[model samples]
Target: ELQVIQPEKSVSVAAGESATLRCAMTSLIPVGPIMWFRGAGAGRELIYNQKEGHFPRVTTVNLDFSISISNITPADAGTYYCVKFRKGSPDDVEFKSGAGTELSVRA
Candidate 1:
């Protein structure tokens, strides 16, 4: 069985602030790669990749697969997910329920 867990389900931060999202995986072997994605209304968009510095604003620490999203903005408010890549004949990826961080912009 595969299981992915995050530190918190929801987080709240003020505008121009910063927050960190933690991702943990269980029963994972031969870890392939880690990817980060942002969720839109009905679709999701890729944000960052560990292999390359795709999203410079976001940083992922090697330990525990923890990620930090800086420069909090109202636009940054959303559900963020950490996906784990699985290797085999055909590469596959899996996403956890995702830890949510709510960013409220205040003037």
Candidate 2:
């Protein structure tokens, strides 16, 4: 079974405020790298660690992971996902199942 876990509910954040998404894993695996993504309209978009784009705030606390998206805006409100990259196979990746943070931006 997948050993990843996160908060089951959304986190509320005010406009111009800061919010954080937490990601925890049951076990640690040596991988190529870690990645983060944002779910957008229609499909998921690469918010961080893909090509050259806006880098999302990320903090690795041992096996636990936390990402902080600051300077919140209305457009920033959405679902965020955490992904783990396999060392040998970059194409192969593991995603946190049934776990994500829904960000709601309010004024």
Candidate 3:
């Protein structure tokens, strides 16, 4: 089982400022890369995928299976999710996503 813990559920920042979105996974059942998404729903887009070596920004702190992005802009105001995948020994793969955090940027 995987559980993600993000201390802040909502973050507010001004444009041109630096912001950090944080989330952490409880167990290390995941291997390879963890996925990061930004959006309000299923139409989310991948932003900071670590496994494939896709760290969106230069200032990113690798959490215990988490994601963080720096550099703030008004467009960055939205929902962000951290995801981890687990391969079921004889079954398939399961991806667990954190509840998500809402970012608010002021211009």
Candidate 4:
């Protein structure tokens, strides 16, 4: 029910540095339980969630739901997605996702 806008197609950061993946939502009211996931298909994995406790090197800004991944490593190179989940009565459902931003880590 909302659009996920990812302004940057990719970001580059040297190893041990930080990269911010950007995103924005069409809704005026932020409907969340929003998450950032790395990779896609079989290799996909969840990387950040505000309520899932602390993410040692991951930080987020509610302004546009952008996230910073710190201490970059070669292993961090891949596409990352900003996802929005529709809050349900009991369980949440994945609703929308940004086109995705690719992270390129320099060694």
Best by TM-score, which number? Answer: 4
The CA lDDT at 51 in model 1 is: 71
Ranking by TM-score: 4, 3, 1, 2
Candidate 2 per-residue lDDT, tens place, 1-107, comes to 34656665698899988778787656566544455678733568765554445675533335666667768889888888766665564365544443667888887
Q: Please report how far candidate 1 places residue 69 from its true position, in Å.
A: 1.2
Error of 1 at 98 (Å): 4.2
| Tens digit of per-residue lDDT, candidate 3, span 7-60 | 778888888777777777777766534666786366778787543565546345
TM-score of each: 0.74, 0.73, 0.76, 0.87
The model with the greater TM-score, 1 or 2, is: 1
- The lDDT, on a scale of 0 to 1, for candidate 2 is 0.65
For all candidates in order, the CA lDDT equals 0.66, 0.65, 0.69, 0.84
Clashing pairs in 3: 33-51
Scored by lDDT, model 4 comes in at: 0.84
Show the colliding residue pairs in model 1: none
Q: State the lDDT of candidate 4 residue by residue for 21-78, as single tens digits.
A: 9988888444657788897576678989888766888987644789888889998999
Task: Please report how far candidate 2 places residue 43 from its true position, in Å.
Answer: 4.1
Q: Which candidate is the best by lDDT?
A: 4
Better of 1 and 3 by TM-score: 3
lDDT assessment of candidate 3: 0.69
Model 1 segments beyond 4 Å from truth?
Answer: 40-42, 88-91, 95-107
List the RMSD of every prediction in angstroms.
2.9, 3.4, 3.2, 2.0
TM-score, model 4 to reference = 0.87
